[PDB]
Chains A and B, each alone.
Chain A
Amino acid sequence: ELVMTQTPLSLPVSLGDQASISCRSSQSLVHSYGNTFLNWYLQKSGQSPKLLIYKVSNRFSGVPDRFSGSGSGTDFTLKISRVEAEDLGVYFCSQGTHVPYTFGGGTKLEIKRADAAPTVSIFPPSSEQLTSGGASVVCFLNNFYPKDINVKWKIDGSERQNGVLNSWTDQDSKDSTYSMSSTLTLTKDEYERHNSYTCEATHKTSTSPIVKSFNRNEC
């Protein structure tokens, strides 16, 4: 069927700047005179896709003029002019000329902003979890930029790699930062025969790593 090739995969852009997103189809999308059914969508984090541009260049009801679309031959372009923080998410082209309808692979728009170091917090296992024979240690690393970050667990000074599970948020539509959670899970047995637990983060903002720690005896 009709392959839609969308580029780039990600698009970092400063506020006020213009972003340009391309889709190329493998054949003409002209359905009939005055009808080329190429659509553009935005899917924000945690939401369904919303229609921005229909029939190549037509702005959907409610969409600002900051958003425009064009296309000649099999080449189509979405432009987002005065980029706002709320514009972040994944942009998709789709064609409705030929069945099966098909979509591009998406473009993730990333808002550029000033570097910001993570706010780091560490959490011992709850007494509730301990009663069950497990022990999870959690570390939040919140509101940082850029999204690249490296987190290390250390137990009594020794690096621990096994038993770690990490998750990142999508970029924040208000402050343009990222957040990350790291959970180290061990048995209650192991937990209770070590003392010092450390969450250590290196980020481009700092030469020295940000360290958060507790000792099992003190708390």
Chain B
Amino acid sequence: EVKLEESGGGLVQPGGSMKLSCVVSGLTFSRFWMSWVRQSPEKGLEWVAEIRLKSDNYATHYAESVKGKFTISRDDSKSRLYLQMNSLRTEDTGIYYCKIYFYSFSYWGQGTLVTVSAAKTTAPSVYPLAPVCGDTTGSSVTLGCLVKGYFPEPVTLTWNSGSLSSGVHTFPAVLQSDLYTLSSSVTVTSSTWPSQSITCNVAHPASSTKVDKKIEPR
């Protein structure tokens, strides 16, 4: 299948600069026009920049808000699209997607998150959430994981390396005072725990933090 993959995202101070890359496969890269598009709560989806073909003398187009500030470029040899961002402002914060398109198709990448902020990188504290003491009340039992006080997004959280996915709710992080807090719950049959191990796996690439927290009965 066609696959697009962005990288280069992360935290950057306002006025700073950053280079996004997008690598494409499953189709002949050099044949098609390419764009960057960003997304945020305040703006929804906003188109950023377009680059055309070698044929078109690699003609580019930019949204007014980013003209002269961003530069879109391509490397047909490596099947790679780039976005050079300079003079970044807080309002340039968002998920950035590359997209490849033609008359009859449009394919987007996964997106890379760009956070423009003066706030500092902070590792999360990861806490196990075990039910209050008792004797198996119900056919079911819910456990949790609290991931508190980190910056920037994202974190990854799984239960038992991902082998536990049904009965999981991972809640979107809430940002306050320049720190995010996220939680996740997992629900299993009462015979499953504590007889079997349930572990919250959490990683925060930005602070190079990886934690496995087993949920132990109180």
- B187 close to A142 (CB less than 8 A): yes
How many Å lie between the Cα of A99 and that of B171 in the bound state? 37
- B105 close to A54 (CB less than 8 A): yes
Within 8 A of A (CB), among B186-203: 187
B132 touches which of A60, A61, A122 (Cβ 8 Å): A122
- B174 close to A165 (CB less than 8 A): yes
Known: A132-B125, A140-B185. A60 touches B148 (CB 8 A): no
- A168 close to B171 (CB less than 8 A): yes
How many Å lie between the Cα of A219 and that of B218 in the bound state? 7
How many Å lie between the Cα of A169 and that of B44 in the bound state? 19
Known: A48-B110, A219-B132, A219-B133. A167 touches B171 (CB 8 A): yes
Kindly supply a per-residue 1/0 record for chain B positions 100-113, scoring 1 wherever the CB is within 8 Å of any chain A CB and 0 otherwise. Answer: 01011111111100
- State the 10 A-B residue pairs at the shortest beta-carbon distance, nearest first: A123-B129, A167-B171, A219-B133, A181-B171, A103-B45, A101-B47, A126-B127, A48-B108, A214-B132, A179-B169
Within 8 A of A (CB), among B21-62: 35, 44-47, 50, 61
Besides A101-B47, A219-B132, 8 other CB < 8 A contacts?
A: A49-B45, A55-B103, A140-B183, A165-B181, A168-B171, A168-B172, A180-B171, A183-B183
The answer, yes or no, to whether A209 is at the interface (CB within 8 Å) is: no
Size of the A side of the interface (Cβ < 8 Å), in residues, is 48
The answer, yes or no, to whether B11 is at the interface (CB within 8 Å) is: no
The answer, yes or no, to whether A92 is at the interface (CB within 8 Å) is: yes
The answer, yes or no, to whether B182 is at the interface (CB within 8 Å) is: yes
Size of the B side of the interface (Cβ < 8 Å), in residues, is 46
29 A-B residue pairs with CB within 8 Å: A35-B103, A48-B110, A48-B111, A49-B45, A49-B97, A55-B103, A103-B46, A105-B44, A119-B142, A121-B142, A122-B132, A123-B129, A123-B131, A125-B127, A126-B146, A129-B148, A136-B127, A138-B129, A138-B183, A140-B169, A166-B174, A167-B172, A167-B173, A167-B182, A168-B172, A169-B172, A181-B183, A183-B181, A214-B132
The answer, yes or no, to whether B156 is at the interface (CB within 8 Å) is: no
The answer, yes or no, to whether B128 is at the interface (CB within 8 Å) is: yes
Kindly supply a per-residue 1/0 record for chain A positions 142-173, scoring 1 wherever the CB is within 8 Å of any chain B CB and 0 otherwise. Answer: 10000000000000000000000111110000
B125 touches which of A48, A99, A100, A129 (Cβ 8 Å): A129
Closest approach, in angstroms, between the C-beta of A78 and any C-beta of chain B? Answer: 15
Closest approach, in angstroms, between the C-beta of A139 and any C-beta of chain B? Answer: 10
- A121 close to B47 (CB less than 8 A): no
The answer, yes or no, to whether A190 is at the interface (CB within 8 Å) is: no
- Which residues does chain B contribute within 8 Å of A49, judged by CB atoms? 45, 97, 108
The answer, yes or no, to whether B118 is at the interface (CB within 8 Å) is: no
How many Å lie between the Cα of A205 and that of B106 in the bound state? 43
The answer, yes or no, to whether A106 is at the interface (CB within 8 Å) is: yes
Kindly supply a per-residue 1/0 record for chain A positions 65-107, scoring 1 wherever the CB is within 8 Å of any chain B CB and 0 otherwise. Answer: 0000000000000000000000000001010100111110110
A106 touches which of B44, B173, B174 (Cβ 8 Å): B44
B144 touches which of A35, A138, A180 (Cβ 8 Å): A138
The answer, yes or no, to whether B130 is at the interface (CB within 8 Å) is: yes
- Which residues does chain B contribute within 8 Å of A41, judged by CB atoms? 106
How many Å lie between the Cα of A63 and that of B78 in the bound state? 31
- B101 close to A96 (CB less than 8 A): yes
Known: A48-B109, A132-B125, A179-B171. A140 touches B142 (CB 8 A): yes
Closest approach, in angstroms, between the C-beta of A219 and any C-beta of chain B? Answer: 4
- Which residues does chain A contribute within 8 Å of B130, judged by CB atoms? 123, 126
How many Å lie between the Cα of A183 and that of B133 in the bound state? 20
The answer, yes or no, to whether A17 is at the interface (CB within 8 Å) is: no
B148, B171, B182: which has the most chain A beta carbons within 10 Å? B171
- Which residues does chain A contribute within 8 Å of B146, judged by CB atoms? 126, 129, 136, 138, 183
